[PDB]
Each structure stands twice: as C-alpha cells, then as structure tokens.
Point group: D2
Chain length 265, copies 4
C-alpha cells in the first residue's frame, strides 16, 4: 500500500463521521500500522474505532493536559514496542466554545473561551510535535487539519482566527521538525459534515443558514465540485502527505477543497 | 489644510519616545488631529513621555486585559473630547509576548499561559478596543493596527509571529463589524524599527534581518526612523483611502515584494 | 493646501469622462497637481473630454505599442513642463484585451496574437512607460497602475485576468528599477467600475448569460465588501491613487493597494 | 502495485537526461505508467535521451508555438496509444525566455517580441496543450505544469518571472475547463534544479539542487489518485523554502 509498514499516530476520532476516522481507515487500507489517541469519551471512541479495518491501540490524550503530553511519547513506544519509532503523526483536533462562533456576536466571545479554542486548535499542534518528534523516524511526516482562514466569513468567527494561528504555528513546527528530517504540513479541507456539522442544524438559526450558503457556494466554485458528505478525498490527501510522495514539501498547506479557493465566482 | 485637520483620534501604545505610537501621535498632531491617548501601566511615567508630544493630550488608563477598563473606555473618552463629539480614528499600537515566547527561548519551550497572554494583548485586544470604541466613532472613521508580516516563519519572532497571524485574521473580522458603522479597519505592516543584550547569536540574527531588509527594499529601509511608518498610519486615518478595509498596507520599503 | 500641491504628474488612459483616469486626473487637479495628459488614438475627441477637467493640461500622444512614441515621450513631456522641471508622478490607467480573450469567447478559443496584444498594452507597457519616464522623475516620486485582483479565476475576465497577473509581477520588477531613482511603483486593485462597456454588458449587449454573471459579480462584490461597493462611483478609487501619488505612503513599493470596499478580504 | 499503475500519461519537456521531465518520466515508468513523450527541436537527439528511460515510449513532435502540431496532436497520441484509449495524465514541463529577458540583461531593455515569445511558450502553451488533450482525457485525469514561485521579484529571473506569474493565472482558468471533463489541473513550484545557495539554508528540510527526484515524485503524486480534491492549485516542492523568510 501507499503507507506500507509505516507507523502512524492519529488523533481526533470522536465519531465515524470524524475526518480522523476516515484518515485512519484509508491509512490502514494502505498498509499503515496505527496508534490512535482519544479525548474524554474513550468508551465511545474505543467502540467507534472497532469498526476500522484493523485493530489499533487507543491512547488517552487531552492536549490541554500537560501530564498527558509529557507521558505521551512513552505510552506510544510501549504500544509500538521499544526499538520502533513513528513515521507519521496526524493532528485532527479542533474546538471553539459556542460563544466564539455562530450567531453569537464576534465581539461577545470571552477571551477565556477564545483562549481555550486557540490552545486546542492551534497551540497543541506544536505541543504534539514537541512530544512526538523525539520518537519519529527521518523521512517522517506531521499533518494537521486546517480550514482556509485567509479571508473572513460569517459564523466561523474565532475558529477562523485559531486556524490563522495554526498556519503560523505549522511554519514554525516545520523549522523544528526539519532537524529530525521530518516534514510538517496542513491539509486545508472544504466543509465536511462531521459532528459539529451541528452548526448547519445549534449555533443559532442564521448561522446555520450561512453555513448552508458556504457549503452551496463551495460546490459551485469548485471546478471539480465538492461533496461534503464524502470525507474520502480529504483522507487520501492526508495519506499523500504521510507517504514518501511529497518529500520536498514542508511548512506548507495542501488544499483538498475541490479547488474552490482558487476561484472567485 | 492639515491631513487630519479637525479629526479626533485615540492612540494607544506610547511607552517611550521611541515607541512607534509616539511618532504616530507626533505626526497626527503635526497634521492637525486632536488626540486622546491611552496608557497601560505606570501612568505617571508615560505622562512625562506624552508631555514631549507636539501638543498636550488627555491620558486615559487602559489595560487591555481588564474588561472593566474596556467597558468604561468609551465614556471616559467622550468626557475627554467633550460629550457631543466622537472619534474619527483609533490607533492600536500594542504588542506583548513574554521572553519565553520570543527571542532566544526554543519555540517548543513556551508555556501556553505566556503565549495566551501574548495573544490576548497582541491580537484579541484589537477586537476589544473596536468593541469598546465603535459606538462612539463617526462614519468614515478609521481603525489602524500595527503588524509585522507573519506570512513566513523567521528566527526569534516565534510566538509573536503567531500572534500577528492571529491579529490579521482578527482585523478581517473587525472590518465586518466596523462596516456597520461606516468605519474602516486596517493594519500597517511595518519593517523593523529600532525601538547584544540577548547574546551573540541573537545580535547577529537582528543585524542580518536589518541588513537584509534594507538590501531587499527597492527604496531601502531606515530602521532608525519611524517617520515613514507614522505617515502611513496617518494616510489610513485620513480620507484618502476610503475604499480600503480588512486590509494590510505594507510600510516596509517594499521588502516583502522581493526575494533577494 | 491640497494633497498634491506643487507636483507634476503624467496621466494616461482618459478616453471618456467616465474613465477612471479621468476621475484620477480631476481629483489630482483638485489637490493642486500640475497635470500632463497622454492620448492614444482619438486625439481630438479626448481633448474635448480633457477640457471638461477643472484645469486645462497639455495633451500628448502616446501609443504604448509605438516604440518611437515611447522614445520621444520624455522630451515631449519636458517640452510641456519646461526644462529644469521634472515629474513627481505617473499614472498608468491603460488596459486592453480583445473580445476573443475576454467575455463570452471560450478561454480556449483566444488566439495568442490577440492575447499577446492584450498583454503588451495591459502589462508590458507598465515597464515601457516606466522606462521612458523614470529618467525625468524626481526622487520621492510615484508611479501607479490600475489593477483588477487576478489572484483567483472568474467568469468572463479570462485572459484579461492573465494580463493583470502579469502586470502585478511586472510592477514588482519596475519597483526595483524605480528604486534607483527614489521612486516608488504601486498598483491600485480597484473594485468593478461601471465603464460604458461595463454598463453595456449589464444591459445585455453580451447576451443573457453574460449579463447575468455581471449582475452576480457586482451584487456579490457589494455584499462581500464590509463597507459596501458602489460600481457607479470611481471617486474612492481616484483618491486612493492620489494617496499613492502623495508623500503619505513613502515606504510602500512593488505593492498593491486594494480600493475595493474590502471585498477581497471576505469569503462571503 | 505502482502508484500510477496502468495510467496513460503524456510527458513533454525532455531535452537531456537532466531535464525535470526526464526524471518525471523515469519515476512515472517505475510506478507503472505507460508514457507518451513529446519533443521540440532536435527530435533525433532527444530520442537518444529517451532511450535511457526504463521502458520504451512512442516519441511525438510538438512545438507549442505550432498550430499544426497542436491541431494534430490528440490524433497522433490516440494513434500511439490505440483507438479506444484515452490519457489519464499530462505533464507540461516547458519553458523559454530569450537571453535579453533574463540574467544580467536589463529588465527595461528586453523587446516585447522577446517577452511575447517567452510568455507564449512558457504560459499560453499550458492552455493550448490543455485545449488539445482534454478531449482525449479520462475522467479523474490530471494535468501538471512546472512552476517557479514568482510571487516576489528576484535578480536574474526577470521576464521569466513575469511568464510564471502569467502561468499561475492560466492554470486557474484551465482548471475551470478541465473540471468539465472531471480532470484536475495543478502546478508544481519547484526549487532550483541544475539544468540560490540560500535555498538550502531557508528550506527546513534542506534542498539539494542536483537532485530532481523529489520534484519528480511530487509531480507523480499529482498525477496519482492521491490528490483527488486539488485543482487550480500550486504544490510547492522546494524544501519548504518559500514558507520561511530567513
Ligand atoms: N468538518 C469540516 O468541515 C472541516 C473542514 C476543514 C478543517 N476541519 C478541521 O478538521 C479537524 C477535525 O475536526 P472534524 O471536522 O473531523 O470534527 P470532529 O468533532 O469529529 O473532530 C474534532 C476532534 O477535536 C477533538 N478534541 C477537542 N478537544 C480536545 C482536547 N482537549 N484534546 C484532544 N482532542 C480534542 C475531539 O475529541 C474530536 O475528536 C479540526 O481541526 C477541524 O477544525 C474540519
Ligand atoms: N519596532 C518594530 O520594528 C515593529 C515592526 C512591525 C510592527 N510593530 C508593532 O508596533 C506596535 C508597537 O510596539 P513598539 O515597536 O512601538 O515597541 P513599544 O514597547 O514602545 O510599544 C508596545 C506597547 O504595548 C503596550 N502594552 C503592553 N501590554 C499592554 C496591556 N495589557 N494593555 C495596554 N497596553 C499594553 C505597552 O504599554 C507599550 O506602549 C506593536 O503592535 C508591534 O508588534 C513593531
Ligand atoms: N472598469 C473596471 O471595473 C476596472 C476595475 C479595476 C481595474 N481597471 C483598470 O483600470 C484601467 C483603466 O480602464 P477603465 O476601467 O477606466 O476603462 P477605459 O477604457 O476608460 O481605460 C482604458 C484605457 O487604455 C487605453 N489604451 C488602449 N490601448 C492603448 C495604446 N496602444 N496606447 C495607449 N493607451 C491605450 C485606452 O485608450 C483607454 O483610455 C485599466 O488598466 C483597467 O484594466 C478597470
Ligand atoms: N531547472 C530549474 O531549476 C526549474 C525550477 C522551477 C521550475 N522549472 C520549470 O520546469 C520546466 C522544465 O525546466 P527544466 O529545468 O527541465 O529545463 P530543460 O532545458 O531540461 O527543459 C525545458 C524544455 O522547454 C522545451 N521547449 C522550449 N521551447 C519549446 C517549444 N517552442 N515547443 C515545445 N517545447 C519547447 C524544451 O525543448 C525543453 O525540453 C519549465 O517549465 C521550467 O521553467 C525549472
């Protein structure tokens, strides 16, 4: 397969609608040996990951928990046995409290909420690279999930700001990862109907309409179209970055959005 | 006629007479603006600095992390310019990142608590001030913030670069809200301004950036002079960029447009 | 004392009194600039237009594809402002792309002869203009060209988009050359302005479909723009050019200023 | 199984064994693609070069400035791949600028006729090759062109930089047309390959300007089905140098 005999960590699975779930599935189809991490509802997460092609160890990881991060590399090594290292890391984690999104005014989000969001959605990319780089092989690859924040838009609000921060964090992580012979990139995906997708049904009628408007305009703008209910094209893109087939790309963003961002109307 | 004749503009961020905000206020005054100034910590000390400005101006206390200062800010400004009057301009020239997040400390070594404080003061506060001051701004008004181009990574700037990226995104959103008021929102991205203390390596890094910046800039770059940056901000506060908002104007000698 | 008091500025691209160049010229004259104008083909018709400016100005002939017109322009400008006087500003508001590379014609069906002519006039000429006039410009001076944001593709604009992309790259290189003279070079990326050709297509002169895309482009532009966009008002763009011609943006060059309502900064 | 297993791919731009297109071709064949090659001037000479390719591939003639080559191309391709067969990928690895538009020669001194020829071969030809070949491409196919990041001005590269800026715009528009066929259009912006020393410096993973394989691999990635939602775009294979200021 594309990732034959590669040992790859995947964070971010919460349902079988999670982008990370599909990244995991495709990685396994492509021959990769996985270690998974989960936040909070690990009973649920375990049951969910049972439906993946192959069995995988599931580790606890709250990115805001300094102890989890500090014990993380050791718990992975045990999971994959001493002598072996990781070839890939997938950051598919995000969060922004309700006050920082939706119909709730941009100006009314408490800094505490915004800060919790940036910690989870942006700072933790660096946290995970820090914990995991010492157990990564050269030629390795760290990949995180992004949503093009280069332009403002309704509803997304402070999550946009967090992704803007994330992209900046990525460029710096690339500097550190390169010392290890490891690449660091982001996959900017178009809208995918995940857990929080959610806002289309929550963030306040109005925000929901705007989300639907965003979705609709995305499919039209994309020269090859965009669905939306299919996370597979995004998972394949992530896998492409984990493979040895983009070996000169780092600190960068690969857009798996149907080309929508390259078109105005 | 002065460029900002009759305009009423609030400037934050003056701490020394070397501060970018100090020269912005100076030029704005030379061009006829009526200023309200804000100050963070030692309010007595900056009063001494602000006394060296071309003309006297009200000095209001504003710690941007204190949500109480923010809630009362508009009232205290209206009291200063006299009730019945509003602001035509707001200048955000505030930035902070602890040494743990910039300079010599390894990028992975910055604790989030410090990063978070840095982001609050350097980016979120742009939204905070806008929230506080938009209800008392005139249509056609202008909010200007200070930026340092964070589109690419670089030595030392580290987490402040991440803050500046955050800020740019914040600026695009503030534009959406300021638009309801007829108000523009923009950032001025400035070249390096002189506002071995960090060691031999850091001193060489800084020298290399400065040399490289003047080298890269088609019209050169004078790190000793904040006057061109001040003037750019005054351009944005004026009425001569009326169709520009959510945007970034680069006052960097054009360095960012050139590879070598 | 106006923004541009005591400055000598060359303006190109006046063809009608609706031309962006016409509004730029008007506002510049209003701000105390001493203008020199250039004209391409209909030299006596444009004089009639240029006489509608608040101040009369020497109209010189310039076909940017005419290599001898370029070779003589500096001298003919000197003749109009008197020796010992130099130019402080230059406005390039010149654009052209044949209907084969723009509008309804399929992107693939534009012949290169047509595209090349478009790129010559719309992009290359920025550099040939700079080349001609730099040796008679004062330091601290300014050259500005008109742009339409080509970073993303869109219906109808087709090869004119390509030319503007080329123009943005040219401007970055012109900046390097002009820097040797203490001169800045910048573009103003304007939002869509109702030229007579723009009003015509909206009316339906390019057919029902083209007319629909036009409404859509304009309606969406004003929507996206946080401060809105009025396609019938070229004044905010003209002031932006004057800002750049002034000394108030002294450290900006090789760059693009967006006078577009902020639309380009907003996804929806 | 190969990455491009069973795929029919046209590859232009091979002139010597050091061409990006040579290694693109080389890596593609290693990944199980059946190739068609195209060459420009010295057809006999470049034929001797394609001999070294791991397999044999039918070599056709294509001057992108020649309307006749372009008009007959798809037919000459179908003839080589057999009726009933289409292409799955196309590689555009073509560039040219007359000396006066590059190097030491002043930016202002280059005649438009030189620039126009550069722009024709370097930028317009991407749409022209797409026009020709899309009617013979399978859905899910991929078109790839070679780019050098022109977003900032730089010494020496000069008018070639203007050509690349134009190419990036053309690519966005080709993607509109290609999408109608279910086909993607992307650019690979590669670092300097021998055909700045500060490039290896800025690159967080370094950069070896004698090694075209990583660039070649990136192109193969875009030709694969592993970047199925990317079009109108630019993929940087430059050691990440463009993401760092210093
Ligand atoms: N669905 C979309 O349209 C879309 C588009 C582009 C990018 N993204 C990004 O893709 C990623 C995955 O989100 P998703 O869309 O798959 O929905 P999701 O809810 O299934 O996955 C998000 C994950 O965040 C995890 N998380 C929250 N707090 C955490 C913590 N403190 N520690 C560890 N994990 C924590 C959750 O447990 C969850 O598994 C995000 O970073 C997101 O912003 C989503
Ligand atoms: N000096 C440069 O080269 C340069 C280049 C580009 C951008 N900038 C930006 O310009 C701006 C001003 O910084 P400077 O270069 O003038 O140095 P400076 O130290 O003189 O100004 C920074 C200001 O931050 C204010 N501040 C810190 N915490 C605050 C709080 N909690 N509440 C209210 N105010 C607070 C300080 O009081 C101070 O006046 C920043 O936004 C900065 O990042 C500087
Ligand atoms: N109308 C819009 O929406 C809009 C928006 C953004 C940018 N622009 C740009 O602004 C500029 C001015 O165009 P406009 O909108 O005012 O319409 P316009 O037709 O009034 O201006 C175009 C000018 O190019 C001149 N020109 C063509 N060939 C020439 C030659 N061989 N030599 C010398 N001059 C020649 C024309 O004669 C004309 O005056 C252009 O560069 C254009 O692409 C227009
Ligand atoms: N070498 C580098 O460092 C580098 C870096 C980034 C991008 N690129 C791009 O990669 C591609 C190939 O570059 P290269 O390094 O392999 O140089 P090269 O000399 O090996 O190949 C260039 C190709 O241009 C072709 N060509 C010129 N005129 C033609 C015409 N009229 N019709 C058809 N073909 C014609 C040549 O025949 C040749 O095969 C170009 O588009 C180039 O700009 C090269």
């Amino acid at each position: 397969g594309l990732l034959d005999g590669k040992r790859i960590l995947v964070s971010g699975i919460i349902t079988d609608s999670s982008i990370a779930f599909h990244i995991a599935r495709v990685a396994q189809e492509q021959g990769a040996q996985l270690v998974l991490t989960g936040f909070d509802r690990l009973r649920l997460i375990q049951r969910i990951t049972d439906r993946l092609p192959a069995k995988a160890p599931l580790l606890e990881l709250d990115v805001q928990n300094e102890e989890h991060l500090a014990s993380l590399a050791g718990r992975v090594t045990e999971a994959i046995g001493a002598g072996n290292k990781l070839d890939g890391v997938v950051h598919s984690i995000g969060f922004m409290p309700q006050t920082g999104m939706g119909i709730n005014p941009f100006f009314d989000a408490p800094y505490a909420d915004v800060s919790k969001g940036i910690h989870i959605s942006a700072y933790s990319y660096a946290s995970m690279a820090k914990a995991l780089l010492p157990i990564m092989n050269p030629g390795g690859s760290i990949v995180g999930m992004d949503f093009d924040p280069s332009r403002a838009m309704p509803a997304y609000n402070w999550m946009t700001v967090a992704k803007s921060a994330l992209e900046s964090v990525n460029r710096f992580v690339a500097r550190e990862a390169g010392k290890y012979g490891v690449r660091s990139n982001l996959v900017a995906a178009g809208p995918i109907r995940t857990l929080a997708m959610a806002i289309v049904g929550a963030l306040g009628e109005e925000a929901g309409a705007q989300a639907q408007l965003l979705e609709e305009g995305w499919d039209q703008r994309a020269p090859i179209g965009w669905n939306m209910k299919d996370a597979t094209p995004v998972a394949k893109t992530v896998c492409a970055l984990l493979s040895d087939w983009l070996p000169a790309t780092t600190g960068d963003i690969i857009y798996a959005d149907g080309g929508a961002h390259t078109q105005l109307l």
